[PDB]
Amino acid sequence: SAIKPDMKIKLRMEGNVNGHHFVIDGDGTGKPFEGKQSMDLEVKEGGPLPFAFDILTTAFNRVFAKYPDNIQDYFKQSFPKGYSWERSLTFEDGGICNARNDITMEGDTFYNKVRFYGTNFPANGPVMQKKTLKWEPSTEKMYVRDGVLTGDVETALLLEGNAHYRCDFRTTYKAKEKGVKLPGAHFVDHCIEILSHDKDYNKVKLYEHAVAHSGLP
């Protein structure tokens, strides 16, 4: 195995939401085989961000997911050469984002080149007014569509005042190496949380736990 039980994470995100430019660096560690990761994020340019930090967090690697023996693990078999993903996020009030990550490995470290582009967020909506509290736990449906591994998430952000703000994500995943075999259809359960933050979310500690399963308990 190329992948160790303890791996470092290095990340740079460049992006624009509703015209606002920003650059965010990340440093972290995780346990690929237990499906757990945490990372420290720091806004380097464009802070304080004028939109809900929460919209970025699913962009800050399905290598961090506990896969049982009976599901093909496309992500761990992609290394050391690595893989990319592209994601479209569609929010219920017309906000739309496109994100991508190119993931590489050098020694004990995953490097992440992340881009995040958002537009059409209404000025009076929860993203631009900073009314989000968290992502609900979610299930990602994994299947093959025209020869490409595809994940669908139907999820929601909890808002201030007991309301939910619905999001649908579609992610396409592509190994750099031709001839990594596609998996069968399956599920990955996700829980993402902000563990700590400073006043304007210039510094954030982020955690994710993910488990692959075939639907049964």
- Cα 60 to Cα 19: distance, rounded to the nearest angstrom: 20
Supply the DSSP string of 1-57, one letter for each residue. --S-SSEEEEEEEEEEETTEEEEEEEEEEEETTTTEEEEEEEEEESPSPSS-GGGGT
Structure tokens, 142: 């994994």
- Compute the half-sphere exposure of residue 138: CA atoms within 13 Å on the CB side of its CA: 23
- Cα 188 to Cα 190: distance, rounded to the nearest angstrom: 6
Query: What element of type H or E holds 213?
Result: strand 203-213
**End-to-end CA separation in angstroms for the chain:** 28
Q: Which residue has the tokens 């998996």?
A: 183
Which resolution, in Å, applies to this structure?
1.8
- Cα 29 to Cα 9: distance, rounded to the nearest angstrom: 6
In sequence order, which residues have a C-beta less than 8 Å from that of residue 182 and are 6 or more positions away? 72, 74, 144, 147, 149
CB atoms closer than 10 angstroms to residue 189? 16
In sequence order, which residues have a C-beta less than 8 Å from that of residue 141 and are 6 or more positions away? 151, 152, 153, 185, 187
